[PDB]
Design a protein around this ligand. Structure first.
Ligand SMILES: C[C@@H]1CC[C@@]2(OC1)O[C@H]1C[C@H]3[C@@H]4CC=C5C[C@@H](OCCC(CO[C@H]6O[C@H](CO)[C@@H](O[C@H]7O[C@H](CO)[C@@H](O)[C@H](O)[C@H]7O)[C@H](O)[C@H]6O)CO[C@H]6O[C@H](CO)[C@@H](O[C@H]7O[C@H](CO)[C@@H](O)[C@H](O)[C@H]7O)[C@H](O)[C@H]6O)CC[C@]5(C)[C@H]4CC[C@]3(C)[C@H]1[C@@H]2C
Ligand SMILES: C[C@@H]1CC[C@@]2(OC1)O[C@H]1C[C@H]3[C@@H]4CC=C5C[C@@H](OCCC(CO[C@H]6O[C@H](CO)[C@@H](O[C@H]7O[C@H](CO)[C@@H](O)[C@H](O)[C@H]7O)[C@H](O)[C@H]6O)CO[C@H]6O[C@H](CO)[C@@H](O[C@H]7O[C@H](CO)[C@@H](O)[C@H](O)[C@H]7O)[C@H](O)[C@H]6O)CC[C@]5(C)[C@H]4CC[C@]3(C)[C@H]1[C@@H]2C
Ligand SMILES: COC1=C(OC)C(=O)C(C/C=C(\C)CC/C=C(\C)CC/C=C(\C)CC/C=C(/C)CC/C=C(\C)CC/C=C(\C)CC/C=C(\C)CC/C=C(/C)CCC=C(C)C)=C(C)C1=O
Ligand SMILES: CCCCCCCCCCCCCCCCCC(=O)O[C@@H](COC(=O)CCCCCCCCCCCCCCC)COP(=O)(O)OC[C@H](O)CO
Ligand SMILES: CCCCCCCCCCCCCCCCCC(=O)O[C@@H](COC(=O)CCCCCCCCCCCCCCC)COP(=O)(O)OC[C@H](O)CO
Ligand SMILES: CCCCCCCCCCCCCCCCCCCC(=O)O[C@H](COC(=O)CCCCCCCCCCCCCC)COP(=O)(O)OCCN
Ligand SMILES: CCCCCCCCCCCCCCCCCC(=O)OC[C@H](COP(=O)(O)O)OC(=O)CCCCCCCCCCCCCCCCC
Ligand SMILES: CCCCCCCCCCCCCCCCCC(=O)OC[C@H](COP(=O)(O)O)OC(=O)CCCCCCCCCCCCCCCCC
Lengths: 174, 43, 324, 100, 239, 98, 35, 94, 98, 64, 101, 58
């Protein structure tokens, strides 16, 4: 039910991303999609990722998109087009993807049908793992810098490439 | 004669010089002092 | 949960009153430095001035210029005001006096700070005015620039504490307030807070006389009031954060029974008041930077120093095994 | 039913990105935005699986994928900027000279 | 501890040399005293030297690249196949660089960053060859791809070069998203991303009636990304 | 009579429990280590429970008032030892850990 | 080949993971109670 | 536990309502500057740096010297990039 | 000149030493709480085991009744071939955090 | 398969994984490790458990 | 951090020291190691000088090339010396020095 | 002593902050019977849930 609400908000906001005539409006709806995603992450208990999605996707990436799109001052004539003639091609491609890809987990991960019986009493509690609980943050930090440090450093190389490319392609020094 | 070039760099860029000194202390301590403290503990 | 709204109102309403009187206190202190009297007619000692100004604002007709961004224009002040309000959910005023005891509270505060830029950007763009747009772009760039240094200083405190929980950050200062060993970091944090709240000497939106139009120039009535209220609430919040991170929050100055008599909320309030006074004092003392100068300071001075302090603190704590 | 609901959420985001590619033939900025939507959906897929499987590998890779998404958007918007600067317009008819 | 890193001596050297060349180029390209000299050819010669030294380090240390394989196992896997593949990659990079000097001086393409981006992409491809996990493979592929996006648009005032870059970035990002989706489906279906674990889980069953549609479509999406990369029809028209 | 073995009572008595019911605790933990199935561990659990409830009744008999105050403060502060030092000292002075 | 996954090169995890079996983050919760 | 996030949601709802009341009661009586893109890029990079700092900062007690030096190498790469930006004039707004 | 530099440097050194001392004390406080949780762990686990076993017996009787007259059934059949005991799966992704 | 759990302990399905891997490390035919493999996959997805419980729910709905 | 130097392909020569210390490896440098080191550094300095003439920075270019060559040559000499001590490379000298001290 | 006029609004701000702390503290205490506990983790939640049974079923 709550996942129905968040998924409905995400569906509408994403349609607005892909269908809003004004690109500034598209960037703002994109920001709504990331907020809803963060809500889902909070439902999963991943509060670090929930906050980082706000900090990075909304706080940095969407800001970059907004700065660029706002200064472009795009006129609608340059990007307008009628989409009524795409309904069939989207219908087949969407349906095939829908029929295959929304139900891919069904055969492997069969849902438990909720019965008219209190199964909550069959939840077994192991207190041993509860003496010293780890946050999402410290569980991730136990791994990033020691056992998988090479991937961490390669990501640093990727960011360095981004910095160099941004300078070389756009810089015009006064 | 690189002993007043460093003087000139410090005079003209005090912030960068201070940042280099602070970070360099932060790097020097684990690189040099920590293995010394570990060695004195073994014996 | 039925009593949760009562707690939320007991936070929000006194905060709005505190902002209303922070405006008055700024006027009073500024006047007294300038050898004049601030508002002292509307109410005794001018204490009814904020209510009169708020009443005037609500009784002012709204304009809503004939723009094509009718919804966005009114929603921008709502966004900035709500963001200023919601940061207080995790602020502890004393041991156990906090609405949400978030384990990830530090990162949550960083996220709210990062979200603050959108109200200004949207107000500038939606107002259909090139001057407002340019001013909003400059203000947004300044805020994102100083957010980097704020985040790195946060990391320094986090290294010292080992937990993102604000109450834990306070209680980790029982032995010593972090502002003593990290005093330059505290100075850096206060300056970055000034720049992040668009306050003097970094108040570009206040520089109309310098041919720099603010992002809220097209706003009237309660949208303009919402922008103003959010700004002053953020000033109070930055003072509170300075208190929490470096002055030991609700802790007394000395661990003695004489000091432990007075409640921790009073200690916290007094430290916050000191920092608000410093906000006003600084506005009274100095002229303002140009945009280019303050951007240079943000990227060329405060970022390198913040990163250096991160490296030095972490290296020292690792070396002697003093980590939390 | 939790896992099927979390997966279909990310799935609708991915399908929306695909549709945004399909519906935006004159608007390549939205095409870039649709690609980010797909990347977000994949990131969500890794996080959900990490919880469902009680395994940390999904979480490490999610963080690294966020780094890749950031660099991708930075470089892509730089290329958009220089294309616009050369042509003075973002219309697709001015980026169709290489053909055949 | 230090000897463990003998398995990555070639990569350490080339990365460090690339950093040295970046610093050298940026320091002297901005020099008023030296009148902002073009450094594309100087950095190109130094980078050709760096590539050849990397090749020497790798070829002459064939057994050492397999040292500490258990410690490095969850990061990469070096063997004879990767040995020869990496040697060939370095030789190709050296030849390509050697072919660039007349272009640098006669066109006057003065950007030394071109050489740095080539070297960083070579680092990425080196890590691609030794990748033994979906995560490592994706990261190395992305590093390589981002370097290409930037260098494809290097003539930043040219209509042709900017068009190439724009088409490359959009189609490359799309294909990378498809591949990442496939990787996520495989992880969700098997709980594994390491190639050894995937081999153990998937062997002996293929499609035994009760086939993991998650595994089958993860493979398909990964294959689509790979086919885009090798410019196979119908994922070719970017090329 | 027998105190209700709430979280407050158990947490306040935890030091006495660790000093007194150590063999039963260790035996239970070994058996849990070998087999997580709850049915295959009920006997060691009964041994643990009997030891703990006997110690609880004993401590209640010896120092009723100090135990009551310490348990009450522990419940009031949700088992935060630091906010309960005075009554902890009063409880341990009359009911030594031994 | 027949049973290639049997070849020692492919059994890396079977020999590495026991060496990290006592590392915080992957221990059985009962190991802390008894150690 | 995620229990503590519920008051935040109710707080958001109440703050929104206060905003609407305050705003609604008075209704009763073409010059692209690349330097903004560049500052956005720099903010993105250092935003990710802070992101990666957070788990490291809370994990220093467990990762010890290896984690410290791995993060130092990360920072070395990013700071070489920063030096490149500084030399090229990306940090100058004059 | 040198006065504020010496003051800042000395405050940094001595204050960081004090930060280390405070961290050590905080760590000891946490170990006290954590030891308290360790000594009362067995009795809580034994109570939970008894509760779960009784509930499982009730559910097995329920399943025996419901699946009466369904041929080929086996009440409480372990779906794992190894037969090692696992808690019943719940079908909620992250129930423990809420 | 990694063994790193999301709460800082051994992953739920890691012992099943290790039994399956140890079996396959010496059995020249993977069909000899089928049972351990399906135990690992059952731990990941609980498919047979949920199917059986759904059969119970189905029979309850049929007899009511 | 758990470590394991064990290689996939075993050493084909006697193992004088399974995991030799850094300073031990450096002190194990032979005349041939120093020849490799010096040759790589000299070639690198020469390339730096020659490629630096046209831009007008032959001195700084020599320094940059020399830094690259110093690092590469030291890494190569270390590789050879450590491989000899570990038994991966022909190590007659190491075995002879080991059977005596 | 005229400067004391400026201390009144600051004192009001301080009192406001004290209210935002103490009012929410006392409302929570009245509703839950005990003050809020900082650092409520999985163990504390499990303790409260089990204590509901151990109390009500006695
Ligand atoms: C800084 C800026 C500002 C903006 C921002 O950040 C950025 O601000 C941030 C602020 C964020 C919000 C913060 C907070 C929330 C609340 C969350 O919502 C909690 C929902 C969860 C918790 O709900 C319950 O959890 C416990 C029960 O689970 C309750 O405990 C009881 O039960 C215990 C056990 O008996 C007893 O022991 C206890 O004693 C007893 O009290 C507890 O009271 C109650 O809370 C999940 O619950 C559900 O999940 C269930 C599982 O799926 C569903 O089950 C169903 O499906 C099953 C089959 O699958 C069937 O078997 C079932 O029959 C069938 O019902 C069902 O739908 C429902 O239960 C939804 C997300 C949201 C809005 C965030 C949005 C995003 C933001 C606005 C961010 C935003 C971006
Ligand atoms: C301009 C206008 C002017 C007018 C105006 O507005 C502005 O001006 C404004 C100015 C306002 C006043 C400002 C301030 C206060 C103090 C407050 O009262 C203290 C707060 C209560 C709780 O907080 C304390 O307690 C915390 C926990 O210990 C302390 O934390 C410690 O520990 C931390 C961890 O180690 C460290 O980190 C910390 O550093 C360390 O301090 C925390 O600091 C401390 O504050 C006092 O508690 C007590 O009350 C309890 C009641 O139950 C009693 O319990 C006892 O009974 C139980 C049952 O048997 C037994 O179970 C228990 O065992 C047994 O103790 C007992 O008497 C006693 O506990 C009462 C409200 C009042 C007057 C405000 C009124 C309204 C105004 C006048 C406004 C006014 C409207
Ligand atoms: C010169 O600089 C200054 C400003 O910027 C120009 C100001 O806005 C202001 C004043 C702005 C304010 C007083 C805003 C205060 C708002 C509040 C305290 C919250 C709302 C208060 C009210 C009286 C509105 C009541 C609304 C209702 C629906 C009545 C029911 C309650 C001052 C004093 C000032 O000095
Ligand atoms: C802005 C700051 C810039 C700083 C730049 C200087 C430092 C850069 C990092 C250089 C690498 C390390 C240099 C420091 C030398 C001291 C290392 C040391 O003290 O040894 C420790 C070990 O240090 C290391 O081994 C960490 C090395 C860091 C990795 C650096 C990367 C080098 C190449 C990696 C190859 C992967 C491919 C790269 C991908 C881009 C001993 O620890 P231990 O074995 O006793 O126990 C382990 C630990 O305490 C428990 O977890
Ligand atoms: C194998 C590579 C060894 C190192 C290569 C050095 C890298 C830089 C040398 C590039 C060649 C060069 O410097 O060209 C200049 C000059 O070319 C040279 O004289 C060669 C420079 C050095 C290369 C050979 C010297 C000895 C190298 C031996 C190996 C070291 C410019 O030519 P110009 O404009 O003066 O032409 C006018 C004339 O009419 C040409 O016919
Ligand atoms: C209990 C009282 C607590 C009070 C807490 C708050 C303190 C008050 C803070 C507010 C003070 C007034 C604020 C208004 C001034 C804002 C303008 C700042 C301009 C600025 O930053 O200049 C930079 C230097 O300052 C800086 O760089 C600032 C950062 C200084 C950090 C110090 C770094 C090294 C310290 C030594 C540490 C060594 C010990 C550890 C090993 C250099 O820029 P410029 O362009 O102005 O240059 C011209 C130099 N004439
Ligand atoms: C991109 C990554 C950026 C960071 C840079 C990574 C490589 C530079 C590492 C510099 C520290 C090396 C060190 O101190 O080791 C000796 C050092 C010996 O100390 P000594 O006995 O006092 O000389 O070795 C150790 O015991 C520490 C091992 C640290 C891990 C090294 C990882 C990198 C290996 C590649 C080195 C390449 C050749 C340079 C060796 C000579 C350096 C003086
Ligand atoms: C490797 C680990 C870290 C990697 C990243 C950091 C690497 C360090 C930074 C490297 C960047 C390049 C530095 C270039 C320095 C040039 C100095 C300069 O101006 O030289 C001119 C300066 C004065 O000569 P002038 O240019 O004629 O005025 O020095 C020279 O030219 C000296 C030439 C003799 C040197 C021959 C021996 C070289 C052996 C290797 C050392």
């Amino acid at each position: 039910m709550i996942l129905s609400v968040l998924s409905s908000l995400a569906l509408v906001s994403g349609l607005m991303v892909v269908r809003a005539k004004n690109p500034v409006h598209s960037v703002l709806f994109f920001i709504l999609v990331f907020c809803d995603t963060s809500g889902l992450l909070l439902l999963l208990g991943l509060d670090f990722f929930a906050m980082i999605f706000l900090v990075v996707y909304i706080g940095a990436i969407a800001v970059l998109f907004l700065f660029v799109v706002m200064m472009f001052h795009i006129q609608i004539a340059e990007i307008h087009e009628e989409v009524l003639r795409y309904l069939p091609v989207s219908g087949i491609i969407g349906l095939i993807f829908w029929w295959e890809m929304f139900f891919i987990l069904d055969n492997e991960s069969i849902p438990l049908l909720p019965t008219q019986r209190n199964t909550t009493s069959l939840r077994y509690t192991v207190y041993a793992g509860k003496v010293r609980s780890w946050t999402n943050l410290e569980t991730l930090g136990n791994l990033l810098y020691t056992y998988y440090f090479v991937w961490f450093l390669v990501s640093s190389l990727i960011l360095l490439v981004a910095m160099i490319g941004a300078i070389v392609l756009t810089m015009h020094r006064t | 004669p690189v002993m007043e070039k460093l003087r000139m760099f410090v005079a003209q860029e005090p912030v960068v010089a201070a940042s280099c000194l602070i970070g360099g202390v932060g790097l020097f301590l684990p690189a040099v002092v920590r293995p010394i403290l570990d060695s004195l503990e073994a014996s | 949960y039925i009593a949760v709204p009562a707690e939320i109102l007991g936070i929000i309403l006194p905060l709005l009153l505190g902002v209303a009187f922070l405006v008055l206190a700024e006027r009073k202190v500024m006047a007294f430095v300038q050898r004049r009297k601030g508002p002292d007619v509307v109410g005794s000692f001018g204490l009814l001035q904020p209510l009169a100004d708020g009443l005037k604002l609500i009784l002012k007709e709204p304009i809503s210029p004939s723009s094509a961004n009718f919804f966005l224009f009114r929603m921008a002040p709502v966004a900035t005001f709500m963001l200023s309000l919601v940061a207080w959910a995790v602020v502890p005023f004393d041991y156990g006096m906090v609405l949400s005891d978030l384990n990830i509270g530090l990162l949550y505060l960083f996220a709210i700070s990062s979200l603050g830029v959108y109200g200004i950007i949207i107000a500038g763009r939606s107002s259909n005015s090139k001057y407002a747009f340019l001013g909003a772009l400059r203000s947004a760039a300044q805020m994102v620039s100083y957010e980097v240094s704020i985040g790195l200083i946060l990391i320094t405190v986090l290294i010292c504490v080992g937990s993102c929980n604000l109450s834990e950050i306070v209680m980790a200062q029982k032995q010593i307030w972090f502002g003593i060993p990290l005093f330059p970091v505290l100075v850096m944090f206060f300056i970055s807070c000034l720049a992040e709240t668009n306050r003097a000497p970094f108040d570009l939106p206040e520089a109309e006389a310098e041919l720099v139009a603010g992002y809220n120039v097209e706003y009237s009535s309660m949208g303009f009031a919402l922008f103003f209220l959010g700004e002053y609430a953020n000033m109070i919040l930055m003072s509170g954060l300075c208190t929490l991170f470096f002055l030991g929050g609700w802790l007394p100055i000395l661990d003695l029974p004489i000091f432990k008599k007075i409640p921790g909320s009073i200690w916290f309030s007094i430290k916050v008041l000191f920092f608000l006074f410093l906000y006003i004092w600084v506005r009274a003392a100095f002229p303002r930077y140009r945009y280019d100068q303050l951007m240079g300071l943000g990227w060329k001075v405060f970022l390198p120093l913040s990163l250096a302090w991160v490296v030095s603190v972490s290296g020292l704590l690792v070396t002697f095994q003093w980590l939390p | 039913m939790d896992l099927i609901k979390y997966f279909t959420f990310s799935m609708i985001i991915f399908i929306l990105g695909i549709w945004g590619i399909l519906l935006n033939r004159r608007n390549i900025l939205i095409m870039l935005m649709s690609i980010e939507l797909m990347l977000l959906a994949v990131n969500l897929n890794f996080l959900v699986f990490s919880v469902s499987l009680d395994d940390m590998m999904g979480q490490v890779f999610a963080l690294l994928v966020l780094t890749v998404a950031a660099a991708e958007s930075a470089i892509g918007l730089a290329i958009f900027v220089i294309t616009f600067r050369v042509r003075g317009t973002i219309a697709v008819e001015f980026i169709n000279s290489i053909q055949g | 501890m230090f000897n463990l890193f003998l398995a990555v001596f070639p990569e350490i050297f080339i990365i460090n040399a690339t950093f040295i060349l970046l610093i050298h180029g940026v320091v002297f390209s901005t020099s008023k005293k030296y009148d902002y000299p073009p450094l594309a050819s100087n950095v190109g010669w130094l980078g050709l030297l760096s590539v050849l030294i990397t090749l020497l380090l790798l070829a002459a240390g064939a057994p050492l690249l397999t040292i500490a394989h258990l410690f490095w196992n969850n990061l990469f896997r070096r063997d004879n196949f990767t040995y020869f593949c990496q040697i060939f990659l370095l030789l190709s990079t050296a030849g390509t660089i050697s072919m660039c000097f007349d272009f640098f001086d006669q066109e006057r393409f003065d950007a030394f960053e071109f050489i740095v981006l080539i070297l960083l992409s070579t680092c990425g491809m080196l890590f691609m060859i030794s990748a033994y996990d979906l995560i490592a493979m994706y990261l190395a592929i992305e590093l390589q791809s981002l370097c290409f996006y930037v260098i494809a648009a290097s003539k930043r005032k040219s209509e042709f070069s900017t068009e190439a870059g724009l088409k490359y970035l959009i189609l490359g990002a799309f294909s990378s998203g498809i591949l990442l989706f496939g990787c996520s489906m495989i992880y969700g279906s098997t709980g594994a991303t390491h190639f050894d674990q995937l081999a153990k889980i998937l062997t002996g069953y293929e499609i035994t009636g009760a086939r993991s549609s998650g595994i089958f479509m993860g493979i398909l999406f990964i294959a689509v990304g790979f086919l885009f990369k090798i410019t196979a029809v119908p994922f070719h028209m970017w090329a | 009579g027998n105190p209700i073995p709430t979280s407050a009572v158990l947490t306040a008595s935890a030091k006495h429990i660790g000093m007194r019911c150590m063999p039963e605790n260790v035996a239970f933990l070994k058996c849990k280590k070998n087999d997580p199935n709850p049915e295959k561990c009920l006997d060691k659990g009964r041994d643990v429970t009997r030891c703990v409830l006997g110690l609880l009744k004993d401590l209640h008999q010896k120092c009723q008032k100090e135990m009551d105050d310490y348990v009450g403060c522990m419940y009031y502060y949700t088992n935060e030892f630091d906010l309960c030092r005075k009554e902890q000292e009063a409880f341990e002075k009359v009911c030594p850990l031994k | 080949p027949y049973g290639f996954w049997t070849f020692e090169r492919h059994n890396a995890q079977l020999r590495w993971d026991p060496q990290i079996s006592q590392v915080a983050g992957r221990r059985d919760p009962y190991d802390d109670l008894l150690e | 536990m995620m229990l503590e996030f519920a008051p935040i949601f109710i707080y958001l709802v109440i703050s929104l309502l206060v905003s609407l009341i305050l705003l609604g009661v008075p209704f009763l009586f073409s010059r692209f500057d690349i330097r903004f893109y560049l500052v956005s890029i720099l903010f993105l990079i250092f935003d990710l740096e802070v992101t990666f700092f957070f788990p490291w900062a809370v994990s220093l007690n467990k990762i010890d010297l290896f984690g410290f030096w791995s993060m130092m190498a990360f920072l070395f790469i990013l700071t070489i990039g920063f030096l490149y930006e500084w030399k090229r004039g990306a940090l100058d707004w004059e | 000149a040198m006065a504020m530099f010496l003051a800042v440097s000395g405050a940094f050194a001595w204050g960081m030493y004090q930060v280390g001392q405070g961290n050590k004390i905080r760590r000891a406080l946490k170990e006290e709480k954590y030891a308290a949780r360790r000594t009362i762990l067995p009795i809580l686990q034994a109570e939970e085991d008894e509760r779960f076993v009784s509930e499982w017996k009730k559910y097995l009787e329920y399943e025996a009744d419901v699946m009466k007259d369904v041929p080929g059934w086996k009440v409480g059949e372990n779906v794992y071939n190894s037969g090692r005991w696992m808690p019943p799966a719940t079908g909620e992704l992250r129930p423990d955090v809420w | 398969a990694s063994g790193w759990g999301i709460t800082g302990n051994k992953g739920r399905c890691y012992d099943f994984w290790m039994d399956f891997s140890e079996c396959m490390s010496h059995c020249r035919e993977p069909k000899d490790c089928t049972l351990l493999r399906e135990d690992y996959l059952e731990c990941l997805h609980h498919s047979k458990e949920f199917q059986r419980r759904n059969r119970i729910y189905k029979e309850e709905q049929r007899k009511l | 951090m758990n470590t394991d130097i064990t290689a996939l392909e075993k050493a084909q020569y006697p193992v004088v020291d399974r995991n030799p210390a850094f300073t031990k490896v450096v002190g194990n440098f032979s005349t041939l190691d120093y020849l490799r080191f010096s040759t790589i550094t000299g070639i690198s300095v020469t390339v730096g000088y020659l490629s630096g003439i046209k831009p007008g920075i032959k001195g700084p270019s020599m320094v940059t090339g020399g830094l690259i060559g110093l690092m590469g040559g030291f890494m190569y000499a270390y590789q050879n010396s450590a491989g000899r001590l570990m038994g991966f490379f022909p190590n007659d000298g190491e075995v002879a020095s080991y059977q005596k001290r | 002593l005229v400067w004391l006029e400026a201390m009144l609004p600051l004192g009001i701000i301080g009192g406001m902050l004290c209210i935002m702390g103490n009012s929410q503290y006392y409302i929570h205490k009245a509703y839950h019977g005990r003050p809020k506990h900082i650092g409520h983790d999985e163990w504390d939640v499990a303790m409260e849930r089990r204590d509901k049974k151990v109390v009500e079923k006695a």
